[PDB]
Design a protein around this nucleic acid. Structure first.
Ligand SMILES: Nc1ncnc2c1ncn2[C@@H]1O[C@H](COP(=O)(O)OP(=O)(O)NP(=O)(O)O)[C@@H](O)[C@H]1O
Ligand SMILES: Nc1ncnc2c1ncn2[C@@H]1O[C@H](COP(=O)(O)OP(=O)(O)NP(=O)(O)O)[C@@H](O)[C@H]1O
Ligand SMILES: [Mg+2]
Ligand SMILES: [Mg+2]
Ligand SMILES: [Zn+2]
Lengths: 703, 389, 398
DNA sequence: TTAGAGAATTGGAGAGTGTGTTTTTTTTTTTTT
DNA sequence: CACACACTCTCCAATTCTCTAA
């Protein structure tokens, strides 16, 4: 077969038969092999070497190709791909298998076929806009998955035992169109009750989903359109009911006598043969992270001011509210679940309650967390129910047996449940979340179903006080209207007030008007870009797991004991035992923010500060100052310790001068590791050595 | 779906945890080439009706040693600081009394019902989660997430054949064991009145859609609840309880649990919690002076199936006189208050004391309950009587 | 064509057989008696039903570039005339509200509510509200409902509704069982139907509790979040609200503040950009003028037309004014003035000046610049917006 | 030039094969009570 | 199961082609 120098001249054919014949088929095969081997990104890095290597590391049998890259590098393949998608995807699968077995010669033991998936295809279509013009073409659509079958085995290459003799009928390919009837046995011509040879038959995973238009893209009072889609092989369980997805697939039609007799006209059934599923929720998975991305994340973690940067990156368009940003950062990164002895589970997720005045950006904080977090569920007040929050039982739509279904807390199982207008809920709806908040489970005993579902989510709620205005004359317990069991289930408990303060009002006004200028259609520390923050968050949550070695038990124990005393004194907030475990969770969350594999006293002091400041915030005006001096003098607001390193430096300089008269930074840091004062960067940024005329340089190491 | 064959039939029941060994296969007599799959079971390993003789004689030893009650109580929820009387009552609930049928055919309940009621953050849910895992038969359900039909038993039509069938609820699934009803104050009153018969008579009489029967629900109810005002709020007294006297009289013990703010208690509790969180990485080493959960589960099952005690005569005399004294005290307390207490002291509470004494003896595999057992039962019950008065 | 539309269908009446009875080589076959004797029909009988086959559909009685190309040169000239008109503010007010006697400030507020601000999206993806919300409180004898009627009959895509619900879905949304599927589905409310429009809510003081709660999310975040059995949804409610309300006990008292005169809570109060109050003064000359105007509208009648204002509004709303630095300084200083003035009554139950009122000033100045088709907001626009906002604060206090 | 006797082709009768069929109750959930 | 429809195949004989005599 001679190489074909121009695929583009169809010479009167259509694309389907043109690429079906051998010459153009081999030319397409070689072009796709060369594309995979030689395509490089803007930095010159061979992207497909990395992608195939990751696929073979993880045994995933599927290779995502970016259509933008294909169109940029090899034009005619991008030209023919949407016109004859089945044929070219078959050729691409063959070529990808050749390249994969060139890279990893033993990968045939793991797979026998590589599925090339296409992403970022510009041929986006609305479900309501699909026409007969799109038939047998590669389309891209969006919608919410509303139904899913179980993963079912489907015949792909089926063999039949002959009904009389021992012969086996040849491989017949399943089509998605009709049942394959064997015909007659070529040995003996019998055509009786044939039966499938299960052992010699090749099966494939099958899953039929129904997607419909997303409820925010449909018009009000209008019914949504929907399509069936077939997921085959490793595309099964790419989505669940409720998932917003983008779906690339072949728009396929076949004759259906049922539709013909339903309509009275020869109407053909339609289905999408899915090629690529991408959840609009998970725009970036952990598998999508490249070596550049993880190198960026790990190098960025070494900044040593990263905690302030991460805190500042929480809702960068909101002035002030540094304590809110801190608490939301800790909740967003989260702690670690633990189960000592396999018999005592304790939650790792941190729950947050933002109570306070109108127009104080509580809802804006909640919508920011919704936007930034993967697996965010947002709900509001009366719009939620006990049943809808937790889980619900219904007659199955077609078969009519009772079936359990996932509520918001179950759907957010490794994510965030956001409850705006939390005080406006019904008590019966609000009490439903207790088990999910603490025990991280939802137990249902209804209509013959008796089971517990996992609801390991983090609850971030927003509320108003009684009368819609916080009263410093009263404590939090006196003006919230919530009760102790629900108040104690929130680890971080924030009060936001809108009191007059002219200088802060001027700065806030300038920030707000500057924001309106910046975002037109066209604290000090600087934040991360939000894309980088999302990548950092998912890496920190999935690839990093803090472990607590010690936390200086005496400090936290004494703190908890007298925090209990003052809570009993004022009645401002119940403290129970949950606040201790909140301390451990917040320490683990700060360690995760710093990407530490092990928790340290830096994290413990951060958690201590958060707890004490919020508890102080719950108090009245006069009581608040006395509480401030109480917990500040006696307990640990460990701001800095520069004096010890200062006189260690002075002592070392005095001894060195005395030695020389009659590498100092190495001497200093040696003493700083000998004594438990290891955070020396703070001393090097502080003024105490500077006005004493010392200085530092990481290269010269002289001071 | 699982296909079992010959002796694998009735080797398991709903609620069992299993490891199946079998052939993944299609049935062979939505889509075109779709085939329904199932596992043809070739072996069943119930993860955990028989005790090996070595386990058997070790259980005899464990019952024989003199401080078995204390060892069991320390084995109940070892990760929980304090609550020793509550753990002891839970041990009595786990072992249960002795069920009896009298000469006239009337049955007397053997199981013990326990209600924990009060302040938040007092490990009530952790105790329920322990008991559900430690009991040989045990189910956990939230009061909010349950209904009358789903608790006792439900009636429904089958798509395979248009006839009405029964499906067991929590009580039926836990028949022979414990139902751990968390959030017990949250369930609806109409759903709460469903379990009265299953609590006392230990039966569920259904007459619905033509099918009329009486199922068995011989199970303990261990319930957790909060006060009406969240915390107990000690000035309120009887207004802290919205439960009816009917449901409250069906509970053998009602532990009103109050979170006591004491400084040394708080320091010890905090150090315990911090050490508990710290020790998660320590390879799960064995411990002295207590029973592992997997062993205590088997021991409870063995004692339940083997030993049913009775009261001795002198022990019964002691119980009689103490009951009369307690009844007079309760009457005079209600008269002095000029108001009815939410917790009534009834003949079911007498029989509850009897059941607790029998459970204490069953821990030791003794055919008879002694005055010591009756005294300990009365000591545990007088916490519930403290909770009444 | 969509369900509820009244359409003229042009085509043919045809007859469609029961095709399930017909057996052919392509496909085999699946109280009145049909016609018989066809080979394809066998021993069965063929019934018929009448079906209309429409070659054309139309209604029975009916981008920026898209607007430009759709409209005509004469319409361009009229748009340019209005853009260059002096006294355009009051001209548009009088043209939109001819039946209304007086209440010239309420007319201005409603006009700027129609023009609206510029929506924006933050760097983190959260949205900043562009729509303007206005509430008209007054005695039942005043013109509060007539403002809503004029707005609704002027503007397209607008809804009129009472605070009390005519349906299971009231203002926001509801969840009801499908009669065909026996399945829980959304029923859309007035705000959802008014998405990207104006919702004129009369008797706003009489909301049901579900709407009283969900209006919090609908008025500021412009979404309605539903979490019930069988349905999880975030429903867009990008609507400008024109509310009308009655004082408690049915009449206003000027000695009391508006917070004392109406039952709206402080969270609901903070949502509205402008508040207006109508008191029925027992003034004989005003009654004289009212009767004259009404009977003239009924007898004699038998500046600008509403169609012209529709075209000009549709043209002008595509403008996106930017904030000048000097106008930014003016907004900042005006908000500092407003906040420190509110500090004199913050301890004594004022309509406390939240950040929402700063952003309402921004929205109102942007609406002014849109009305004048300006590329950039100016201190004159900021001053007029501040005038309306400040007068609303003062009238709310007393 | 017509038509009639013998041989070959086409019409259709009928023998044989394969396919399809005979209001009711309990429970949930949201909204309305 | 069993009793009607629906469909195919085969054989039989009736009509038309070819060659001859009246
Ligand atoms: N400190 C702030 N910085 C920036 N914008 C702010 C700030 N405080 C309030 N806002 C703005 O105020 C508006 C209202 O915010 P929102 O989150 O709805 O308030 P809220 O906390 O939800 N009050 P409420 O809904 O009654 O409970 C938004 O446009 C915010 O951007
Ligand atoms: N004495 C204790 N020892 C150890 N952990 C404890 C103790 N008391 C409370 N906790 C912890 O507190 C948390 C809450 O426990 P939980 O079982 O929910 O108590 P509860 O009384 O049921 N709370 P509530 O449902 O609001 O009444 C868990 O993480 C427990 O481990
Ligand atoms: Mg809010
Ligand atoms: Mg609990
Ligand atoms: Zn054969």
């Amino acid at each position: 077969i001679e190489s074909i120098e121009n695929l583009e001249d169809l010479k009167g054919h259509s694309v389907r038969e043109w690429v079906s014949m051998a010459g153009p088929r081999l030319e397409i095969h070689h072009r796709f092999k060369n594309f995979l081997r030689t395509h490089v990104d803007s930095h010159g890095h061979n992207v497909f070497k990395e992608r195939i290597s990751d696929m073979c590391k993880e045994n995933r049998e599927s290779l995502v190709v970016n259509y933008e890259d294909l169109a940029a590098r090899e034009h005619v393949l991008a030209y023919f791909l949407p016109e004859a998608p089945a044929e070219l995807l078959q050729i691409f699968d063959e070529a990808a298998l050749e390249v994969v077995l060139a890279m990893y010669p033993k990968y045939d033991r793991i797979t026998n076929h590589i599925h090339v998936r296409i992403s970022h295809l510009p041929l986006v279509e609305e479900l309501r806009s699909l026409r007969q013009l799109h038939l047998n073409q590669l389309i891209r659509t969006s919608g919410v998955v509303t139904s899913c079958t179980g993963v079912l085995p489907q015949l792909s290459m089926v063999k039949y035992n002959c009904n009389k003799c021992n012969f086996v009928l040849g491989p017949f390919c399943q089509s998605q169109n009709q049942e394959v009837k064997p015909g007659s046995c070529p040995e003996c011509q019998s055509a009786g009750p044939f039966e499938v040879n299960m052992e010699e038959t090749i099966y494939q995973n099958y899953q039929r989903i129904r997607i419909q238009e997303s409820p925010g893209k449909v018009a009000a009072g209008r019914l949504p359109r929907s399509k069936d889609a077939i997921l085959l092989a490793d595309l099964v369980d790419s989505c669940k009911p409720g998932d917003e997805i983008e779906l690339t697939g072949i728009y396929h039609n076949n004759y259906d006598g049922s539709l013909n007799t339903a309509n009275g006209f020869p109407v053909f059934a339609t289905v999408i043969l899915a090629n690529h599923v991408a959840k609009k929720d998970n725009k970036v998975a952990v598998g999508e992270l490249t070596d550049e991305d993880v190198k960026m994340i790990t190098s960025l973690s070494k900044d040593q001011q990263i905690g302030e940067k991460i805190f500042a990156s929480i809702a960068p368009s909101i002035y002030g509210h540094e304590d809110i940003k801190r608490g939301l950062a800790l909740a967003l990164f989260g702690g670690e679940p633990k189960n000592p002895g396999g018999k005592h589970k304790v939650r790792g997720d941190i729950n947050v309650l933002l109570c306070g005045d109108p127009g104080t950006a509580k809802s804006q904080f909640l919508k920011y967390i919704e936007k930034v977090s993967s697996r965010a569920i947002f709900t509001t007040g009366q719009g939620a129910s006990a049943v809808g929050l937790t889980a619900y039982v219904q007659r199955h739509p077609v078969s009519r047996e009772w079936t359990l279904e996932a509520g918001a807390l179950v759907l957010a199982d490794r994510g965030v449940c956001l409850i705006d207008e939390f005080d406006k809920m019904n008590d019966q709806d609000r009490t439903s979340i207790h088990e999910a908040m603490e025990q991280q489970s939802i137990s249902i005993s209804k209509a013959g179903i008796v089971t517990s579902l996992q609801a390991r989510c983090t609850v971030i709620a927003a509320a108003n006080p009684i009368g819609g205005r916080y009263d410093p004359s009263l404590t939090f317990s006196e003006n919230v209207d919530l009760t102790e069991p629900i108040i104690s289930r929130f680890d971080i408990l924030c009060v936001v007030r809108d009191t007059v303060d002219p200088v802060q009002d001027e700065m806030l006004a300038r920030f707000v008007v500057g924001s309106h200028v910046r975002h037109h259609p066209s604290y000090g520390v600087e934040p991360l870009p939000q894309e980088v923050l999302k990548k950092y968050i998912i890496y920190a949550k999935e690839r990093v797991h803090p472990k607590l070695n010690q936390m200086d038990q005496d400090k936290v124990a004494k703190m908890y004991s007298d925090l209990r005393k003052e809570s009993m004194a004022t009645g401002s907030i119940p403290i129970t035992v949950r606040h201790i475990e909140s301390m451990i969770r917040m320490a683990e969350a700060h360690a995760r923010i710093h990407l530490r594999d092990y928790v340290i006293e830096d994290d413990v002091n951060m958690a201590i500060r958060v707890m004490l400041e919020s508890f102080i915030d719950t108090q009245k005006f006069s009581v608040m100052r006395s509480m401030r001096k109480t917990f500040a003098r006696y307990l640990s607001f460990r701001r800095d310790n520069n004096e010890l390193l200062l006189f260690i430096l002075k002592q070392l300089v005095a001894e060195q001068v005395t030695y020389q008269r009659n590498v100092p930074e190495k001497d200093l840091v040696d003493k700083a590791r000998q004594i438990n004062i290891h955070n020396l960067s703070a001393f090097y940024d502080s003024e105490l050595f500077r006005m004493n005329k010392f200085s530092h340089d990481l290269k010269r190491k002289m001071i | 779906q699982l296909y079992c064959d010959r002796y694998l039939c009735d080797k398991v029941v709903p609620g069992n945890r299993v490891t199946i060994m079998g052939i993944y296969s299609i049935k062979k007599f939505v889509g075109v080439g779709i085939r329904s799959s199932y596992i043809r079971v070739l072996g069943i390993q119930v993860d955990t009706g028989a005790v090996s003789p070595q386990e058997e004689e070790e259980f005899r030893r464990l019952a024989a040693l003199p401080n078995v009650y204390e060892v069991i109580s320390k084995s109940i929820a070892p990760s929980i600081f304090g609550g020793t009387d509550m753990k002891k009552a839970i041990a009595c609930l786990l072992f249960g009394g002795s069920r009896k049928r009298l000469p006239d055919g009337l049955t007397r309940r053997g199981d013990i019902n326990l209600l924990m009621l009060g302040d938040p953050g007092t490990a009530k849910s952790q105790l329920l989660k322990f008991v559900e895992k430690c009991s040989p038969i045990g189910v956990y359900t939230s009061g909010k997430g349950s209904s009358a039909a789903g608790l006792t038993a439900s009636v429904m039509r089958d798509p395979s054949s248009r006839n009405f069938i029964m499906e067991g609820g929590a009580m039926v699934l836990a028949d022979g064991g414990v139902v751990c009803i968390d959030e017990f104050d949250k369930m609806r009153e109409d759903d709460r009145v469903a379990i009265h018969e299953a609590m006392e008579q230990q039966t569920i009489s259904i007459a619905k859609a033509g099918i009329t029967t009486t199922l068995n629900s011989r199970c303990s109810v261990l319930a957790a609840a909060n006060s009406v005002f969240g915390r107990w709020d000690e000035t309120k007294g009887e207004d802290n309880i919205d439960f009816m006297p009917t449901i409250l009289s069906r509970f053998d013990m009602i532990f009103i649990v109050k979170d006591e703010h004491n400084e040394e208690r708080d320091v010890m509790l905090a150090k315990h919690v911090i050490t508990l969180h710290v020790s998660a990485l320590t390879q799960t080493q064995a411990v002295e002076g207590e029973i592992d959960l997997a062993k205590l589960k088997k021991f409870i099952a063995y004692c339940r199936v083997k030993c049913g005690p009775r009261l001795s005569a002198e022990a019964a005399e002691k119980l009689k006189n103490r009951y009369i004294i307690m009844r007079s005290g309760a009457r005079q307390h209600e008269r002095d208050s000029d108001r009815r207490s939410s917790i009534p002291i009834t003949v079911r509470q007498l029989e509850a004391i009897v059941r607790i004494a029998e459970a204490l003896s069953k821990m030791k595999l003794q055919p008879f309950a002694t005055e010591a057992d009756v005294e300990e039962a009365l000591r545990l019950f007088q916490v519930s009587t403290l909770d009444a008065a | 064509a969509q369900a509820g539309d009244k359409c003229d269908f042009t085509g043919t009446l045809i007859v469609v057989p029961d095709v399930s009875k017909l057996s052919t080589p392509g496909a085999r076959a699946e109280e009145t008696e049909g016609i018989r004797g066809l080979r394809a029909l066998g021993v069965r009988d063929l019934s018929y039903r009448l079906v209309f086959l429409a070659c054309c559909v139309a209604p029975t009685n009916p981008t920026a570039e898209s607007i430009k190309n759709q409209m005509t040169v004469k319409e361009w000239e009229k748009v340019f005339e209005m853009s260059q008109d002096k006294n355009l503010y009051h001209n548009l007010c009088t043209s939109l509200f001819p039946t209304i006697h007086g209440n010239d400030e309420v007319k201005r507020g409603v006009l700027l509510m129609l023009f609206g601000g510029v929506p924006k999206t933050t760097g983190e993806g959260t949205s900043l509200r562009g729509d303007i919300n206005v509430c008209i409180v007054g005695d039942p004898s005043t013109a509060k409902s007539q403002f809503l009627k004029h707005v609704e009959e002027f503007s397209p895509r607008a809804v009129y509704t009472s605070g009390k619900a005519s349906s299971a879905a009231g203002l926001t949304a509801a969840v009801v069982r499908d009669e065909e599927s026996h399945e829980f589905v959304i029923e859309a409310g007035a705000l959802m139907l008014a998405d990207n429009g104006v919702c004129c809510i009369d008797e706003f003081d009489k909301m049901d509790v579900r709407d009283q709660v969900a209006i919090h999310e609908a008025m500021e975040q412009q979404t309605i979040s539903i979490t019930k059995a069988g349905v999880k949804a975030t429903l867009n409610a990008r609507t400008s609200i024109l509310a009308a309300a009655n004082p408690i006990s049915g009449h206003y008292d000027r000695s009391k503040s508006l917070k004392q005169n109406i039952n709206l809570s402080a969270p609901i109060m903070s949502r509205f950009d402008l508040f207006f109050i109508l008191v029925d003064e027992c003034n004989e000359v005003t009654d004289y003028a009212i009767a004259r105007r009404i009977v003239d509208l009924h007898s004699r009648i038998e500046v600008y037309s509403l169609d012209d204002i529709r075209r000009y509004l549709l043209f002008a709303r595509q403008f996106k004014p930017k904030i000048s630095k000097e106008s930014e300084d003016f907004i900042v200083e005006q908000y500092k003035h407003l906040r420190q003035r509110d500090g004199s009554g913050v301890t004594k139950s004022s309509w406390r000046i939240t950040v929402r009122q700063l952003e309402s000033m921004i929205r109102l100045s942007e609406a002014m610049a849109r009305m004048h088709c300006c590329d950039e907001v100016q201190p004159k626009h900021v001053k007029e917006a501040f005038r309306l906002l400040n007068k609303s604060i003062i009238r709310v206090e007393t």
